[PDB]
């Protein structure tokens, strides 16, 4: 297991434009295209991302290329964020993957309300962190995925993904 395999499980792979759990146009391995309700706007974003006229369909190699870029950018963003860097740097590699997973799903703004969870994680209060993480819109809207990510933070193992 690693962040790539973990997100591939949580996000799936679809080669045609689809709507994510929030109803937003997406492609590949959970690559958010736009929050615009315009399918034409999403198609434009897709074309821009891939560098060709895709007509709303991409290949597996193309999906994987976007995915690698997205994981990389998620990490680089974390390292540039004064609220996230300290916690990320304090974590072991397995729990780092859990952090990247959350940022990938919700974005940095999406994780702004997690200040108290973040402190518990930095403190290595794992069971307490796990309890606090579940007190969230995230947990309620995507409970199965949230439970896997939370288990990963609680245990520092890949048990939830085996
Ligand atoms: C509870 S959300 C979150 C976001 C980032 C990190 N991080 O260590 O970069 C951890 C948790």
From Swiss-Prot:
Pfam families: Phage_lysozyme. CDD domains: T4-like_lys. Its EC number is 3.2.1.17. Changing residue 11 to N: Loss of 84% of enzymatic activity. The lineage of its organism: Viruses, Duplodnaviria, Heunggongvirae, Uroviricota, Caudoviricetes. GO terms for biological process: cell wall macromolecule catabolic process; defense response to bacterium; peptidoglycan catabolic process; viral release from host cell by cytolysis. The gene is E. Optimum pH is 7.3. Changing residue 132 to M/F: 2-fold decrease in enzymatic activity. The active site is at residues 11, 20. Keywords: Antimicrobial, Bacteriolytic enzyme, Cytolysis, Glycosidase, Host cell lysis by virus, Host cytoplasm, Hydrolase, Viral release from host cell. HAMAP family: ENDOLYSIN_T4 (MF_04110). Signal peptide: none annotated. GO terms for cellular component: host cell cytoplasm. This is Endolysin.
